[model samples]
Target: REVKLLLLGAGESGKSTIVKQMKDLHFKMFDVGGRSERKKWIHCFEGVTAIIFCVALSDYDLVLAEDEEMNRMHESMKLFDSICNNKWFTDTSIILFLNKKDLFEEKIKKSPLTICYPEYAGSNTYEEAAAYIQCQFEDLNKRKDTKEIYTHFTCATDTKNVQFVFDAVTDVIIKNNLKDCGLF
Candidate 1:
């Protein structure tokens, strides 16, 4: 069977780019960038094997503790929630890319690794942000009706790390026996 896949994310979050890379692995991909496009593709998403949700922290200015940044982060999360909540992937696995981790402190001067959410007003580091994001994932897992969503931090610019993401996807596909190619 074919693994129909959809890559979802806000504009310029590297969704298209990642799709291209995944294409190299012989997977069929569709990039649903916005509402209208997603609506058009909704009917075609049936039997999809996976949906990768890519979000860049830098895009949301999540490095700062500013009220506006926080609001945007929450808004982004809500958007993702809506996407996953739409029953778009009831039988498919989900993956999240907390992209732009490399630019955390260099561009934003703060990293999720240095500070916790409560201490965000001060300095922070990448590790801190990772922990917080993982916690959010854990909380989401508690929702009874929601499927367990897996998350990973990836800098697409790094081919090595991108390979890791591919491996992760492939691992999921194999573990779940998502294809008829005898990946098991």
Candidate 2:
């Protein structure tokens, strides 16, 4: 069966790059960027098997293009909440890609996670900081029991890492879709 995957994220955080990688693996998916005109093209969006959401992990320090005053990490959280809680995707699978792990770790040493999450006071260590950011997104899900946000730290430019994650994701999507169709 064909899996209809939807890719949603803010621009410049590597949506197309990952989509390109997905195509190299011969997987098809739809990308919606800019939020203004992406809804009309994907056949009314009724049967999406999954939505692969991408966020640049290092965006905590940067300002959003949508508004020069808004933090990029804050903006990413805002969008993720709206999308993940939407009625259309209530039962759909969500795969969250925290892209730019290497960049995030590098930046976290100098930049604080408190820039986005002011209450965060962990040692600016890599593992701790990454966990805090992941939790920010993971907590947005209204369904903690029925559905899960499967998250991964990604280096979008690294083909080996991208391929490995995408491979596992493809397997998950296919199996889930299969079960929903009574073929599993």
Candidate 3:
């Protein structure tokens, strides 16, 4: 059987960058970044057993905000949610990599960026954002007991920090017996 994994998130949330890291670590990947692309690949997700749902801490507010971008985030969120809820992923494991923690404080200080980091201003830490996002997923997971889903934080620009995400993804793949497909 083939093992598949999906990466979901808004634009510039480091979905592509994380894929690059996975490649560097010798993990084979197929990425679909936009609406058209994702729709084209939806059916291909049927046989997948793992998914990494990553969202940038910096973009969390915007995605959760009221706007066209919010619509995009909502769609991606629904797609991943379906993957977790469907019986197809009953054996699948999902991981949420909260990217861009390093930029939280800096992004908050800036104007346009602050639109997303206002809650994080002066907080200047990952604790709040991480907790909030984790709560969101934990709440979602409560609906189903079949699939295992986890959330973690990492600064994609920082290799060391980025490893936190990779480590989490690796753990899920190993735990779920997905390494044979080459994701481990």
Candidate 4:
């Protein structure tokens, strides 16, 4: 009945917001850019029951506040790839929360996805951009030796969306645990 979940993402990817919404749980949210802290946390993954990978949909148009080498969306992809490709998390249920959908919808009107990712040639619509971004992550997951990555488009600020997704994620964790116990 207990699960230790790790929320992983680049800074400002709404990991903190997701943790706030959880309200009453003990979990670790990895700061992908924090090198020293990351080393400490990497050793703790053996106790993790699930991994929640957060990607901010609105970050496509933003750059990292501290690093100019990568934009937010690209940084998200890199973190996701690193986690998904890691051997330690091969059996861990990976949940993808494409957060900040509300901001993404508004931003898509003003900033085209093509501007951030020249590979994206679709019209500047939320649907197209979201699907493209989601596809990018999914494609990376496919290349990795990992479990099926469950994905959801989310607005972390919306309580209903958070509740629904959180509930479903709990189910996933339970089922995974049951399977590990040879009872599923």
Candidate 5:
């Protein structure tokens, strides 16, 4: 009856805000902080029930505050690439949060997804653009990988959205936990 879900993402990906939405019995969640010291601090936490990896959908046009030359969305993708493929998490279920949909929708009007992806040719509608961003992250996983990624477009600041999203996620974790216990 224990579920340990690790929350991870690059800075400003909205990992922290979502955790405040719920607390279940023995439902452990951990945040390794952002890239201030991500590489060094990330080693200690090993194994988990699941993973929630977020990306700021609105970050396409911005560069990292730390790495001015690097685009924020690109940095998130790189970090996600590393996390999703890491050996320690080979069998772990991944829940991807394409966070900040509200901001993404507005930004898509004023800006363009073309900056983040030079190959992008999709018309700038919220649906098309967000799906394209989701695809970018989803494509990062290995072909041989068996575990399926559950991707959700999340507005982390919105209580009801987070409520609905994590409720399903919690159901997924508990069901998987049951399977792990031979009870499902």
Candidate 6:
């Protein structure tokens, strides 16, 4: 069976990085960039069996280089909500990858989560900030009809981590497919 997977997320959220890793492992690999190219890939949303929603955990402290109006974390949250609430993806398995954990660990030491989220009252540490960010996305999936979202903390540049996450994703898709086919 074939799985038509779609990667969706805000700019710099490591969508491309995840795609590149998958390509390298399963298909003909090639080196691949940028913001304005978003519209060009919207066509991919069609025929998607699963959605790999990537969010950069380190994005809480940055803004888009080209678009100052776009706060990376906020934008990622919006995209997550948009896709999760959309009817088309109701049956689609949603996998959340909290990417850039390495950068996040480094940044959280200096940059507090309160800077981006004033409501955050937790200690200024990597664990607290990561948990807060993870909850932000988790809460978005609390809708009654939405299926449980599988989440993973990832550093996209780490091949072993990416491979492990992708392997889990494969298992999820296969199980879902089997269930859908009344063979689970």
Q: What tens-digit string does per-residue lDDT give for candidate 4 at 1-184?
A: 2365555554445776766665565644444345566557656555344556567776666776675666777867777777677777766667788887778888877856664767888887777777887787888777444376778897655445346555757897999998889633
Per-residue lDDT of model 1, residues 1-184, tens digit only: 4455566665555566565566535644444554476557657566454555666665544434565345345666677666665665575556677766666647545433332245444344556556666666546545535466677787656565345545756787887885655643
- Structural similarity to truth (TM-score) of each candidate: 0.59, 0.70, 0.55, 0.68, 0.69, 0.65
Summarize candidate 3's per-residue lDDT along 1-184 as a digit string, tens digits: 3356565555455666766666523444565554466558557565455556666555544555455455333455566567567765655567777676766646545543344324433343445645655665667666545656667676555546445546756786887886456643
Question: How accurate locally, in lDDT, is each candidate?
Answer: 0.58, 0.68, 0.57, 0.68, 0.68, 0.66
Clash count for candidate 2 is: 0
Q: Predict model 2's lDDT versus the native.
A: 0.68
Candidate 5, residues 54-73, lDDT tens digits: the string is: 67665677666675686877
Clash pairs, candidate 5, are none
User: Would you give me the overall lDDT of model 1?
Assistant: 0.58
Order of quality (lDDT) = 2, 5, 4, 6, 1, 3
lDDT of 6 at 37: 64
Candidate 4's C-alpha runs over 4 A off are 11-13, 24-49, 65-68, 143-146, 157-184
Q: Which run of 10 residues does model 1 get worst, by summed lDDT?
A: 110-119
Ten-residue region with minimum lDDT total, candidate 5 = 157-166
Of the two candidates 3 and 4, the one with more favorable lDDT, higher being better, is 4
Error of 5 at 114 (Å): 1.7
Residue range with the least summed lDDT across 10 consecutive positions in model 4 = 25-34
Candidate 6 Cα lDDT to native: 0.66
Model 2 lDDT tens row, 96-143: 778777778678667576677568878888888778877778887756
Model 3's alpha-carbon lDDT is 0.57
User: After TM-score superposition, what is the CA distance of residue 137 in candidate 6 from its true location, in Å?
Assistant: 0.4
For model 3, state the Cα shift of residue 29 in Å.
3.7
- Candidate 2: give the clashing pairs: none
